[PDB]
Curated annotation (Swiss-Prot), chain A:
Function: Transcription factor binding AP-1 sites. Heterodimerizes with proteins of the FOS family to form an AP-1 transcription factor complex, thereby enhancing their DNA binding activity to an AP-1 consensus sequence 3'-TGA[GC]TCA-5' and enhancing their transcriptional activity.
bZIP domain ranges (all copies): 2-65
Residues included from the entire protein: 267 to 332 of 347
Record protein name field: Transcription factor JunD
The family this protein is said to belong to: Belongs to the bZIP family. Jun subfamily.
Assembly mode: Heterodimer; binds DNA as a heterodimer. Component of an AP-1 transcription factor complex composed of JUN-FOS heterodimers. As part of the AP-1 transcription factor complex, forms heterodimers with FOS proteins, thereby binding to the AP-1 consensus sequence and stimulating transcription. Forms heterodimers with FOSB; thereby binding to the AP-1 consensus sequence. Interacts (via MBM motif) with MEN1; this interaction represses transcriptional activation. Interacts with MAPK10; this interaction is inhibited in the presence of MEN1.
Organism, as annotated: Homo sapiens
UniProtKB/Swiss-Prot annotation, chain B:
Notes on the domains: Binds DNA via bZIP domain; DNA-binding is under control of cellular redox homeostasis (in vitro). To enable DNA binding, the bZIP domain must undergo a conformational rearrangement which requires the reduction of the interchain disulfide bond between FosB and JunD (in vitro). The bZIP domain is able to form homomeric oligomers via formation of interchain disulfide bonds under non-reducing conditions (in vitro). Under reducing conditions, the disulfide-bonded homomeric species dissociates into monomers (in vitro).
Protein name: Protein FosB
Annotated region (Basic motif), positions in chain: 1-20
Residue intervals of the bZIP domain: 1-54
Coiled-coil annotated residue ranges, if any: none
Residue window of the full protein shown: 163 to 216 of 338
Species assigned in the record: Homo sapiens (Human)
């Protein structure tokens, strides 16, 4: 009977180990994804700011020539 | 039935980290897409205006 308890305990510990491993993998993958997305959003935000500036200037020119 | 409890109990553990990271991922994906649409629209407007000046 004791062997059954030891075996269920072993199975539990194994499932816990593999769960922790997969969880850490997911967390790492998500962290990388967040970093990448932040970089891309920085480049995109800067591009958008520059474009808004350029559009504002162009509008200023069109108006000045009225 | 044992693997259902195993997987469910597994994912319920410390799921707040993965939930914070996944939520942040969602916000960043949306912000990304909308930024891309804004860039496209702003480029169309820029080409338009440049055409207008001439
Ligand atoms: Cl598992
Ligand atoms: Cl997980
Ligand atoms: Cl700027
Ligand atoms: Cl105008």
């Amino acid at each position: 009977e004791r062997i059954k308890a030891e075996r269920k305990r072993l199975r539990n510990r194994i499932a816990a180990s593999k769960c922790r491993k997969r969880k850490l993998e997911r967390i790492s993958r998500l962290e990388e994804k967040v970093k990448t997305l932040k970089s891309q959003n920085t480049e995109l935000a800067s591009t958008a700011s520059l474009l808004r500036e350029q559009v504002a200037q162009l509008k200023q020119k069109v108006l000045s020539h009225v | 039935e044992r693997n259902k409890l195993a997987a469910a109990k597994c994912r319920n553990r410390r799921r707040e980290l993965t939930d914070r990271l996944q939520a942040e991922t969602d916000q960043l994906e949306e912000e990304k897409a909308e930024l891309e649409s804004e860039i496209a629209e702003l480029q169309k407007e820029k080409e338009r205006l440049e055409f207008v000046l001439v």
